[PDB]
Symmetry: C3
Subunit: 274 residues, 3 copies
Amino acid sequence: NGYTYEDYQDTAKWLLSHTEQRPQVAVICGSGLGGLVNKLTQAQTFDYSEIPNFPESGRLVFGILNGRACVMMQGRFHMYEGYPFWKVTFPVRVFRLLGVETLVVTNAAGGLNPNFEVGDIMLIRDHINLPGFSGENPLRGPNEERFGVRFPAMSDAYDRDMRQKAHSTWKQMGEQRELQEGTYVMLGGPNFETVAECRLLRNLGADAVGMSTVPEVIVARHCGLRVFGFSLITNKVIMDYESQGKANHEEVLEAGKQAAQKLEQFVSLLMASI
Amino acid sequence: NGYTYEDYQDTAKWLLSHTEQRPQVAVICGSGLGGLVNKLTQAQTFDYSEIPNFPESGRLVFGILNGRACVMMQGRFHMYEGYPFWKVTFPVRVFRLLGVETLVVTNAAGGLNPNFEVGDIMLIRDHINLPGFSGENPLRGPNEERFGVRFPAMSDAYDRDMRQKAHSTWKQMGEQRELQEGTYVMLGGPNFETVAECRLLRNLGADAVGMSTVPEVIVARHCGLRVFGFSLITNKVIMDYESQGKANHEEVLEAGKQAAQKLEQFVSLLMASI
Amino acid sequence: NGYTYEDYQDTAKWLLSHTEQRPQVAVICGSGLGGLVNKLTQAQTFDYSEIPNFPESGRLVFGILNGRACVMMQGRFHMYEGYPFWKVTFPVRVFRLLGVETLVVTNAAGGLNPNFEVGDIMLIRDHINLPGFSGENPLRGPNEERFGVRFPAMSDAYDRDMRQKAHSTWKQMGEQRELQEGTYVMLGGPNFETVAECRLLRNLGADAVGMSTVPEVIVARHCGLRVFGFSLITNKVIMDYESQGKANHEEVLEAGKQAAQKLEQFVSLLMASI
Ligand SMILES: O=c1[nH]cnc2c([C@@H]3O[C@H](CO)[C@H]4O[C@@H](CP(=O)(O)O)O[C@H]43)c[nH]c12
Ligand SMILES: O=c1[nH]cnc2c([C@@H]3O[C@H](CO)[C@H]4O[C@@H](CP(=O)(O)O)O[C@H]43)c[nH]c12
Ligand SMILES: O=c1[nH]cnc2c([C@@H]3O[C@H](CO)[C@H]4O[C@@H](CP(=O)(O)O)O[C@H]43)c[nH]c12
Ligand SMILES: [Mg+2]
Ligand SMILES: [Mg+2]
Ligand SMILES: [Mg+2]
Ligand SMILES: [Zn+2]
Ligand SMILES: [Zn+2]
Ligand SMILES: [Zn+2]
């Protein structure tokens, strides 16, 4: 870890003296949810560039959403951009020092489960941390007891009650497609997977594949935060050689734009379940 | 990535001013194919040590092979020697700047498919990038748009037409053994795999296991190169505990020497299919 | 690798001039076996802090155990603490330079095999090196021929004869539970695995999961050492979502304390089988 405990405190101190807002919930906006910061009331924005110690991008926005005090990251950091996990997850620890109690994390992912369709929303019930198997972990290094324990458990990382309420909220929205729920696997990227790799990941028990989130969840659980997350299925991964399809970021972005309104409403409504 | 865009250009410039040769095809010679540089006509060799910015080894040879202008790497770089992938793949980007359009990559690999025999040639139809799952990727870092896109697809990395023609060429050579075709999995090395690991890799869907190639293919596809590759099966990996066999580099080298003449003829002939 | 050949020699020289002991066996004490150093006779201890070049912790103890000259590490190094594998395995090469011929390595591990119970001892018959698949390997870098070969085989890493004798010794101890034997998989840590990851590891063929040992075994085999190892099953990993259990280090430590007397007797007795 490159940051000292003091660096985290210094950043939290700067934020507390520049806004009267005191968030209880933090939201890391993944693909398709970037526009959520526009729904906040009594909002205050800080470009990441103005906040001491923050990694380069991106804006941090404080405000009220459906009755809850929130702090949102419009744009996140990725291992594929060259960032070490201690940088990617820096904001999570700052949020804890600010008084946050719940972390909502979202992303865009390729569908491995054959029953998923583009546009589906998949609640993350569990994850598979591939980089972690090789030691690439935000917790690598001496443990800071002021945040958490040396060996934190992860089998109960995704809050059960929040997932239960998510389905209830979904029914109230009267959506046609059912709300999916499964396992998210994280890999480094930035290239899209080969057919052999996709077949491999599905056989490992994964339902969706992406390049983020897991590191943030690990750090959040370590410092005691409640966690809720979901993936927007932006594409169905290619599983055979006779297929003419091919993953492409252009289409992925469009899927995100198409689901934007739905994702924003979903999140706003679930604020009351926290 | 440690190299700047300018470093690549500088190296390409040095090469262009030191030889009149203008290659259209690049060949990275793996185990057993080191002698191919001796078949080139109007050849010109440069030890890697004389080329500015080149990683340490190894010779770069320009020349004509069966009617095609080529540039060949006699000796490649490996992650197990301590090289980061941005170093291992440096030559691939230089080749693109030189005007190359097709990359032929070869290697020696252990056979996982039970039907393979020592001496067999396996066309690479797909790959599994294990280091990539953990973020070890030549593309890690800010993307250079002058080479390619941020999220390149890899499901169609190994050119279908070239593989089709490879089988046709094989029949004309009248070989006894059939030309194999499957999935190559790359791992770091340098130790040979345990029985448990071999069983694991086979269950992942891999047909052959090696310690190179994949990084070069990823960088090649990113910058638009057409790719063709194959593995020389130098040994059948140990799959059980009651077996007395044991992988050893001495035997692997001998298998390469035994297939040398065959590999050289095969490559020379397939030059006309490009 | 950060250490020079001379660094290893310098450390071995310091140790040889500070004790008359000349060990033939080295024991790296994992969880639950820390108290074994108290059974040595004619013992001499060196805190790791007093030995030039040694990584930070931990004590190195020389002495006689059941008739054999030994050198034991009371405390080991882990990748999750931030140590590169060339640091974690430094002592193994020093032991070889001292004249050691056999390495005994032990650890605490989570049980993946459904038949294992807390307190069980599992002889390590094989391993799966996940960090190694991505290149994280103590042998990464130029090879030092004075220690071993560039491509060492690992399929016969765990000595068959010693495992055979281990079962004989077990019967003489008249234990109620049978001595288990299987595959150990190493991952980075420090967090405990999710349910999805545990299901994944079991399907890979692993019987126990831990965060050490493998790197030490790889380096030992490379320099010619005979190797014997075993895991103390400190907990049964959570394999389903309806389970209320959850891995926790407190319970893991207690399991180690409960098996301490048994582990110490087991090791002392097997000294005669070396
Ligand atoms: O098929 C996929 N494989 C791996 N990743 C992805 C993604 C995610 O969107 C981007 C590429 O279009 C990648 O960048 C991240 C985006 P996010 O911050 O996780 O929402 O994860 C990947 C979508 N589909 C796939
Ligand atoms: O059984 C194998 N497992 C992993 N790698 C290999 C290899 C390859 O040859 C060398 C060891 O003899 C290694 O070095 C590279 C050679 P290449 O540049 O990929 O042709 O990949 C490995 C052969 N058999 C096996
Ligand atoms: O369930 C487990 N998963 C991964 N590791 C472990 C362990 C090992 O004990 C510690 C955590 O309690 C970790 O630290 C090491 C200890 P050792 O030096 O290998 O004996 O490996 C892990 C026990 N149970 C599990
Ligand atoms: Mg700044
Ligand atoms: Mg030079
Ligand atoms: Mg010291
Ligand atoms: Zn100010
Ligand atoms: Zn000149
Ligand atoms: Zn002294």
